[PDB]
C-alpha cells in the first residue's frame, strides 16, 4: 500500500545530518516510491504523520556510532538500536519511536552510518557523504534491506 522513509538527523550537527542529506537528495530526485519524511532532529513529531498513512513498511535513516570505520553502513533492529544509539553515551535509544509504529506497520527497518564528526556548526565529512550517496542510490533497488550487512557486534 504505502512505504515511508523517515530521515532523522540535524544538517549542521556534523555527520549527524545523515537523514537530512538523504531527504534532500530524495526530495530533489525520488527513489523506490518512498514517501520520504524528515524528522528534522525531532522525529517524534512525525509519528502522527506516519500514522495517517498506516504504512505497509517503514525505513529510518540516521548516523549511528557502531565502533566501525567512518562511513560504514549497517541495518539495525529495535532490539539492538536500544543499546547501539546510546553507544554515543548520550543519544536517545530511538527504538522508542519504532515502538509507536511497529504495532501497526507491517515492517519497521533502520539503517545506521558510522560518524566521525558530530557537534553543532560542523559539516558532514566525506566518508559519511559517500555513505548517504550509496544509500540514496540503493533506494531504487533496495527491495527489503539493500543487501547491507546487519549490525551484530560483528561476531557469530
Query: Residue length, the chain?
Result: 156
Q: Give the chain's largest Cα–Cα span.
A: 40
The CA–CA distances, whole Å, from 116 to 16, 40, 82, 85 equal 9, 20, 21, 15
The H or E element containing residue 79 is helix 78-84
Residue 41 per-residue DSSP state: T
How many whole angstroms separate alpha carbon 28 and alpha carbon 26? 5
Q: What share of the chain is helix, strand, coil (3-state, %, to 5)?
A: 35, 20, 45
The reply, when asked if residue 16 is annotated as ligand binding, is yes
Domain count for the chain, please give it: 1
Task: Give me the residues paired with residue 38 across strands.
Answer: 7
Contact 15/118 with Cβ under 8 angstroms?
Answer: yes
Give the list of residues 6+ apart from residue 113 with CB closer than 8 angstroms, or none. Answer: 15, 18, 61, 62, 63, 64, 71, 72, 73, 128, 131, 132, 135
Q: Is 90 annotated as a binding residue?
A: yes
Residue closest to 38 by CA, chosen among 57, 18, 67: 18
Output the domain CATH number for residue 12: 3.40.50.1450
Angle between helices 126-138 and 18-28 (to 10 degrees): 40
Q: How far apart are CA 21 and CA 23, in angstroms?
A: 5
* Beta pairing partners, 35: 4
Burial class (CB in 10 A: 0-12, 13-18, 19+), 87: middle
Q: Experimental technique used?
A: NMR
Residue 117, phi then psi, degrees to nearest 5: -125, 120
Can you read off the three cell numbers belonging to residue 48?
502522527
The DSSP code for 57 is E
Q: Which helix (H) or strand (E) holds 108?
A: strand 107-113
Is 99 part of any known ligand binding site? no
Q: Vertex 123, ends 117 and 128: CA angle to 5°? A: 60
Residue 105: all three cell numbers together: 506497520
Question: Whole-angstrom Cα distance, residue 42 to residue 56?
Answer: 23
Query: Residues 43, 51: contact at Cβ < 8 Å?
Result: no
- 35-38 and 57-61: which strand pairing? unpaired
Grid cell digits, residue 120: 553543532
Pairing of strands 73-76, 107-113: antiparallel
Grid coordinates belonging to 11:
544538517
- Among candidates 13, 32, 9, 12, which has minimal Cα distance to 22? 9
User: Which domain covers residue 21, as residue numbers?
Assistant: 1-156
Amino acid at each position: 500500500m504505502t512505504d515511508v522513509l523517515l530521515c532523522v538527523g540535524n544538517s549542521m550537527m556534523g555527520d549527524d545530518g545523515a537523514g537530512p542529506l538523504l531527504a534532500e537528495k530524495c526530495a530533489a530526485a525520488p527513489k523506490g516510491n518512498w514517501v520520504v519524511i524528515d524528522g528534522g532532529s525531532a522525529p517524534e513529531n512525525d509519528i502522527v504523520a506516519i500514522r495517517e498513512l498506516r504504512p505497509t513498511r517503514l525505513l529510518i535513516v540516521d548516523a549511528t556510532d557502531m565502533g566501525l570505520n567512518p562511513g560504514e553502513i549497517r541495518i539495525i533492529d529495535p532490539d539492538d538500536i536500544a543499546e547501539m544509539f546510546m553507544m554515543t553515551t548520550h543519544n536517545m535509544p530511538l527504538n522508542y519511536l519504532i515502538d509507536q509504529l511497529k504495532e501497526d506497520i507491517g515492517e519497521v527497518i533502520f539503517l545506521g552510518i558510522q560518524p566521525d564528526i558530530v557537534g553543532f556548526y560542523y559539516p558532514m565529512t566525506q566518508p559519511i557523504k559517500d555513505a548517504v550517496e550509496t544509500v540514496y542510490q540503493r533506494l531504487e533497488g533496495w527491495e527489503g534491506n539493500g543487501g547491507f550487512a546487519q549490525l551484530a557486534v560483528e561476531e557469530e
